[PDB]
Swiss-Prot record:
Domain of life, per lineage: Eukaryota
Location in the cell: Nucleus
Protein name: PHD finger protein 20-like protein 1
Assembly, per entry: Interacts with methylated DNMT1 (DNMT1K142me1). Interacts with SOX2.
Role description: Is a negative regulator of proteasomal degradation of a set of methylated proteins, including DNMT1 and SOX2. Involved in the maintainance of embryonic stem cells pluripotency, through the regulation of SOX2 levels.
Residue range from the parent sequence: 5 to 69 of 1017
Domain spans labelled Tudor: 10-68
């Protein structure tokens, strides 16, 4: 589908916050920088990390969860 999935506690908007799993399998509070509706992926920034670690993650990924 052309719309993000219903993932309760995740808001699919630019600047919304969630928790994201990095490439070393650690969870960090993160921010949505961009949303690609064609590829169904979002550019995720890991808070208090360099933007060099920013990653395109599929919006249905198990690497995304709600920030409580």
């Amino acid at each position: 589908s052309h719309m993000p999935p219903n993932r309760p506690g995740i808001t699919f908007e630019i600047g919304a916050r969630l928790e994201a799993l990095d490439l070393l399998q650690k969870w960090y509070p993160s921010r949505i920088e961009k949303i690609d509706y064609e590829e169904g992926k979002m550019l995720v920034h890991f808070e208090r990390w360099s933007h060099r670690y920013d990653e395109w993650i599929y919006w249905d990924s198990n690497r995304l969860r709600p920030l409580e």
